[PDB]
Amino acid sequence: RPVAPLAHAMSPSVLVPAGLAGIQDGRGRFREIMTAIMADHGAFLPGDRSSDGDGILWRLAGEPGPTGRPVPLGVSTAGIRLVLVPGLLAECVSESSLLFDDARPDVERYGYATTLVRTGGRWGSARNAAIIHEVVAKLPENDTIVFVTHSKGAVDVLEALVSYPDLAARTAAVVSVAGAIDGSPLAETFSDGLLRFAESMPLSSCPPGEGTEALDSLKRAYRLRFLAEHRLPARVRYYSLAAFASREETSAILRPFYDILAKTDALNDGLVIAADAIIPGGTLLGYPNADHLAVAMPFSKKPSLLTSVISKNSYPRPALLEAIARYVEEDL
């Protein structure tokens, strides 16, 4: 695309150390919690692996040490409900994959209720925000609501919190997992024609979108403008995990997109750059060593061409989701 229209749409933005955008560094305590969880009951959890070194969570510079304070490893009685919100195209592959599906037995064992929200896989954030608003309105009043979101789901939820003060007042926390907070430059990379055809083609698992509504929601200019123009509700707590893996531990299907992003930032999960995946003013929990899909969306149906090309899908999602729940309960 010629640069003039992109320039006109872009709001001034700056890449800064996390501290300068009001981010609390919770990387040390989160590593501590997740590591203890896996030492305590990781052995039969799907995706179990060594927690040593960068195995589960990358060690970026400046990481705080462990606090030494005991990690809760029993059943929660806090009445917390994790409201799971998926991202782009998730609805379309629902037969093969549901968000954190293999992690929900483990967190429910330990006292955390879970609800999965079905969003439009090909719909814009405003339309999905209304869906989320209606779902949460029907959840039990005494539950403590903690969103756990993936990809576009994160900004579906942020737009909802900004649009519906009653949802904001109802919500204790939002956790972003590889959330597309600043969108992705890939949303602009491909032709409108291609995006329009993808939006409108008949699929038996997800309804079509209008125009390019879903991708419009993921454009960097749009997403940066949202954050420039709307304060996130202050009474809600925000937390972010930003995934990336090495090229060889990145799924085949994601590698061509990884390769585009890696031209300027190797710390990307295939679809989202890590610096674009952190909610400003929130808490940074860390960097799962996993590509965009492995960190949150299990694919296991065999055989499947789809499952086969998502070739690096193994990650300890149950331990990750349990660590998220325990960190937020502790932080709250």
Side-chain angles (χ1 to χ4, degrees), residues 2-230 232-300 303-332:
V3 74
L6 175 62
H8 298 157
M10 182 63 63
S11 311
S13 64
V14 54
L15 175 64
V16 290
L20 266 51
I23 305 301
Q24 305 179 22
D25 197 341
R27 288 178 292 155
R29 180 55 178 176
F30 187 79
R31 175 181 307 278
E32 190 171 15
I33 287 173
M34 191 170 172
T35 297
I37 283 176
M38 298 175 76
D40 179 83
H41 56 269
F44 289 96
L45 299 183
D48 191 51
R49 59 165 69 169
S50 176
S51 62
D52 296 351
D54 300 306
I56 55 167
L57 298 162
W58 287 100
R59 299 163 288 181
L60 264 70
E63 190 181 295
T67 68
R69 128 168 47 41
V71 180
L73 289 168
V75 175
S76 173
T77 53
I80 289 178
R81 174 177 301 274
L82 311 175
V83 184
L84 311 170
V85 183
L88 190 68
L89 292 188
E91 185 185 30
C92 309
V93 295
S94 65
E95 285 285 300
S96 312
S97 183
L98 298 172
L99 182 65
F100 277 116
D101 211 38
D102 56 347
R104 297 172 67 184
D106 172 81
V107 299
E108 289 186 356
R109 153 163 297 167
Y110 290 110
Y112 300 101
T114 65
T115 290
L116 175 61
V117 177
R118 175 170 172 169
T119 61
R122 303 193 279 179
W123 287 353
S125 286
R127 188 168 192 178
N128 282 348
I131 290 170
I132 295 163
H133 184 219
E134 299 301 325
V135 167
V136 174
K138 296 181 182 68
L139 290 176
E141 266 177 339
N142 290 328
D143 282 353
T144 300
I145 298 299
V146 174
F147 287 101
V148 181
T149 65
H150 178 239
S151 190
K152 184 170 162 293
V155 295
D156 289 350
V157 168
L158 292 188
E159 296 211 358
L161 292 176
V162 169
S163 294
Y164 308 106
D166 54 327
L167 174 63
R170 181 71 187 89
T171 300
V174 178
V175 181
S176 186
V177 186
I181 309 307
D182 296 339
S184 172
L186 295 174
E188 287 270 20
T189 301
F190 308 105
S191 83
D192 293 330
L194 186 58
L195 302 178
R196 281 184 191 185
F197 141 76
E199 284 267 11
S200 56
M201 61 168 304
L203 299 171
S204 61
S205 281
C206 59
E210 297 183 351
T212 60
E213 59 178 285
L215 278 316
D216 293 346
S217 293
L218 293 173
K219 291 179 185 184
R220 170 176 285 181
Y222 189 85
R223 292 263 52 93
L224 284 176
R225 159 116 68 174
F226 172 80
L227 287 173
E229 289 183 343
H230 305 282
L232 301 180
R235 62 156 304 285
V236 180
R237 310 268 259 274
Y238 306 94
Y239 310 84
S240 302
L241 289 155
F244 65 91
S246 63
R247 189 180 192 278
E248 75 171 18
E249 296 302 329
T250 294
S251 293
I253 194 82
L254 298 179
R255 291 203 186 103
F257 307 99
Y258 174 90
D259 286 344
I260 296 172
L261 297 183
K263 289 304 177 126
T264 63
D265 206 330
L267 277 63
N268 79 86
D269 65 17
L271 296 179
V272 185
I273 302 166
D276 296 9
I278 298 166
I279 303 172
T283 289
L284 174 61
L285 300 179
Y287 302 85
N289 192 348
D291 65 32
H292 192 69
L293 293 179
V295 72
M297 290 277 286
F299 290 82
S300 33
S304 170
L305 192 45
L306 181 57
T307 294
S308 292
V309 302
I310 304 173
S311 62
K312 296 295 178 177
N313 192 242
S314 296
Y315 185 79
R317 293 175 291 272
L320 185 74
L321 189 62
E322 191 190 330
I324 290 165
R326 292 200 192 270
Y327 186 103
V328 177
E329 176 180 340
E330 180 176 81
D331 190 64
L332 294 177

